[PDB]
Symmetry: D2
Subunit: 116 residues, 4 copies
């Protein structure tokens, strides 16, 4: 797929499983249109959010529901969620992996952008 999301847990040393993820795309009217959604697998990965034909040039926001994830482990986390906003495919079609590493009061995110 042209878009994949990977989530890691820095407290447990494991993939972040069952993490809800929502993708929005900025519409012409400048509002965030819902584009795709899903949940991470046993390996902390989310595959199949979209296809090459559907994943056109645009501004995208990937929202990772970190709060729900931590609450289900008894932790009262700082953030509501992690948000990643970026322009996609404005220099031709590429493959995007959005990775996040999660702690209760901190997170980091990076992007791996590759051209097939």
């Amino acid at each position: 797929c042209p878009l994949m999301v990977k989530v890691l847990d820095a407290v447990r040393g494991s993939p972040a499983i069952n993490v809800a993820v929502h993708v929005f795309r900025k519409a012409a009217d400048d509002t965030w249109e819902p584009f795709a959604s899903g949940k991470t697998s046993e390996s902390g990965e989310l595959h199949g959010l979209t296809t090459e034909e559907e994943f056109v040039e645009g501004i995208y926001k990937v929202e990772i529901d970190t709060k729900s994830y931590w609450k289900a482990l008894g932790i009262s986390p700082f953030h509501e969620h992690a948000e990643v906003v970026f322009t996609a495919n404005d220099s031709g079609p590429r493959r995007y992996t959005i990775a996040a590493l999660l702690s209760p009061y901190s997170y980091s995110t990076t992007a791996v952008v590759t051209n097939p």
Copy 2:
């Protein structure tokens, strides 16, 4: 200073200087109302955004114009901006420092929540 924002540059190994920073607070209609903003100092810090009386419980968003920072340095930046969304809670006397460490394709953020 119940809220401070500090921004660092992981490429140059320096404070992120003259970075635009916006704080929004979610309203009743769940809209993002502008709350405070400014530009980071020579120390990469932004103080005096708000006061203890004005900084009530609620949901807050800190938005960092990372795109403009990297452009001014001539790196092609991946993110449109860096966004940090959290709930301010009154559980005792608290002060919040929102730190962000910036790279062209990644950022990390942490909250340092302390009792004065």
Copy 3:
């Protein structure tokens, strides 16, 4: 394999390719014995460092040559290398992924520990 190393580049938004990696194991005499070595592939991954029979209980140090990596891109980085030191398999045999995310003046590392 029971030990894999993954390295990402936060400046370029890509896997960190051709990164030299050395693994040491603390010997009885309390010196660091050379245990395994290798280089990351096109995907930023290093496979085949060791086997289940060889990867016994111990204290291990994984040294990632970050300086050589950046120098070959014209960057004069802060760190000599990234070092990850940890006790392995003292609670039974497990699989270890050591991940690093690299910037010129910063890096982060995490561990994904799974039980097959």
Copy 4:
């Protein structure tokens, strides 16, 4: 203060208090000679490690006893310690802050290098 060390807790969202910190300097025989050490304050900071005259160019190692920190909080910590290895260079008047952000299975570190 040409060298400061600051340590933060990504789980509790707080300064890492009373953390042991050791600084070593590589000798001619390429041995790690003890150079300075101490314990972080209530602010997670360690000042007065050295002086401008004593802090000559060379290779330095900052070692943080993260294992003992997490044990005191009852989390099973992955790393034996966190280590940061860098070359101090005289290219102009410089001051170094070595920051580390700690999780049980991960840490990130950055250098803030500034001209007084």
